[PDB]
Amino acid sequence: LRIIWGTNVSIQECTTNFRNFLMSFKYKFRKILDEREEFINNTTDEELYYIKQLNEMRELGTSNLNLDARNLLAYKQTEDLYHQLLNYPQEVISIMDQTIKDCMVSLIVDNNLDYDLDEIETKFYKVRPYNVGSCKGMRELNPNDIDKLINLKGLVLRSTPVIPDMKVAFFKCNVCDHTMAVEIDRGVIQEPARCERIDCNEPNSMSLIHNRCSFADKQVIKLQETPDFVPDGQTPHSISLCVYDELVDSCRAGDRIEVTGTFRSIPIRANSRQRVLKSLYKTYVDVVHVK
């Protein structure tokens, strides 16, 4: 019931499937999918992978879980969730994050562990998938593949400095000091036309305070691909990764990395006349995991 618009994802069903996969994953399944059953271990394969990982996550206190998508392919009940994850990055990733938080708090509660749930529910957990299929290069990504998980490998040529990214504006009313904080949604900030107070109403009382806004890290990394396959007469191509938050300042120049993330496209403004955008979209990649 209740699939989201423009997608094939149902929140309840996807959360159910992800919880099922978390509860009942054993590495022997991946061994079966790898046709490596002759290497099946009695110890590690028996033990529940992600439950244990969530445990050491709880004791250590980390907030990020790295998920192998081929493990999702291994589990029969979540084979469809794999394709749902490729085709719909952001929605399914948020679903996974909520499910991780739910599983953490549930596991604490069920065992009645002395560890307090104050930190757990306040924390924000992130899921970082990887090993999501093949590479296919960048010459072979058609525009229909916008906002999908892609796997890229190459050499990190150049790394820009840290670029602050606005998260909350801090407009201040000059007249009645009505300092409202505006969160950014879908990269848009909406100015109060007049003073949001009813008693005080002065449109010119607003003057954004740059310094008291809350920002977030953003680093652009120039990656030159080294695809496993190269078409005839194709010189190497450079793509612009865009990392966020903790991944900033992680990848140094000269590192040979394999990166997975969301293949995005953004209009580029023709600066000849302001607020006029070119019809050709620039393509870049948001980064979720770096190996």
Q: Which does 179 bind (CB under 5 to 8 A by kind): Zn ion, another protein, none?
A: another protein
Nearest partner of 228 among 133, 159, 128, 148, judged by Cα: 133
What the block records as the tokens of 97 is 């994050």
175 interacts with another protein by CB under 8 A: no
> Minimum CB separation from Zn ion for residue 210, in Å?
20
Q: Which is nearer to Zn ion, 75 or 171 (CB)?
A: 171
> Minimum CB separation from another protein for residue 179, in Å?
6
- The answer to whether residues 52 and 80 touch, using CB atoms and an 8 Å cutoff, is no
SS3 of 83, please? helix
- The answer to whether residues 95 and 126 touch, using CB atoms and an 8 Å cutoff, is no
> Minimum CB separation from another protein for residue 173, in Å?
9
Q: Which is nearer to another protein, 74 or 195 (CB)?
A: 195
Q: Which does 198 bind (CB under 5 to 8 A by kind): Zn ion, another protein, none?
A: another protein
> Minimum CB separation from another protein for residue 185, in Å?
14
Helices (H), the chain: 11-23, 27-33, 49-60, 69-74, 79-87, 89-111, 118-122
Greatest CA separation for the chain:
77
Which one among 32, 54, 120, 176 touches Zn ion, defined by CB under 5 A? 176
User: Hey, which residues does 257 pair with through a beta bridge?
Assistant: 154
Q: Which is nearer to Zn ion, 40 or 181 (CB)?
A: 181
Q: Which is nearer to another protein, 101 or 172 (CB)?
A: 172
Radius of gyration of the chain (CA): 23
- The answer to whether residues 233 and 164 touch, using CB atoms and an 8 Å cutoff, is no
Give the residue carrying structure tokens 């618009």.
Answer: 5
Instruction: Pick the piece of the chain touching another protein (CB under 8 A) from 44-52, 89-97, 173-181, 233-241.
Output: 173-181
179 interacts with another protein by CB under 8 A: yes
Which one among 9, 33, 108, 180 touches another protein, defined by CB under 8 A? 180
194 interacts with another protein by CB under 8 A: no
What one-letter code names the amino acid at 151?
Answer: N
- Applying CB under 8 A, which residues contact another protein? 176-181, 196-199
